[PDB]
């Protein structure tokens, strides 16, 4: 009986314990991809300020053309 | 082991919405440059 109990325990603890490593690798790589998402957002910010500057410059240019 | 897969599915959905954000940014930028260059050409042409 004690031998059978020891066999049961060693088998059940050998089966107790690597695909989660690769899955968490995917998780972290996609976290990097969403840092790239934040990069896309800051690119949008840059395009927004560029649009503002372009509108200001073109409006002043039109004023100058009307002046001339 | 499966809860991390659930987080993976959530990040799948976030990747898809990131793709939609890419499309929106591209559309906005392209329309911006097109309208801007045409408008600037118009105001460099008319006053001459």
């Amino acid at each position: 009986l004690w031998e059978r109990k020891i066999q049961l325990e060693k088998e059940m603890q050998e089966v107790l314990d690597d695909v989660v490593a690769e899955m968490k690798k995917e998780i972290h790589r996609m976290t990097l991809r969403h840092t790239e998402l934040m990069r896309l957002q800051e690119k949008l910010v840059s395009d927004m300020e560029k649009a503002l500057t372009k509108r200001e410059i073109i409006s002043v240019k039109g004023r100058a053309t009307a002046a001339k | 082991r499966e809860a991390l897969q659930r987080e993976g599915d959530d990040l799948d959905g976030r990747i898809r919405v990131a793709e939609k954000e890419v499309a929106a940014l591209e559309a906005t930028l392209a329309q911006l440059m097109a309208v801007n260059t045409n408008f600037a050409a118009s105001y460099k042409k008319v006053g001459s």
């Binding site: 949008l44 649009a51 503002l52 509108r55 409006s59 | 906005t28």
Partner: peptide
């Protein structure tokens, strides 16, 4: 999107100032 509106509002303000000056 709303972020485009902030640029559009500034454009509207500048055009409104121009139109008021012309008035």
């Amino acid at each position: 999107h709303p972020l485009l509106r902030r640029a559009q509002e500034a454009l509207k303000v500048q055009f409104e100032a121009n139109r008021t000056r012309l008035q």
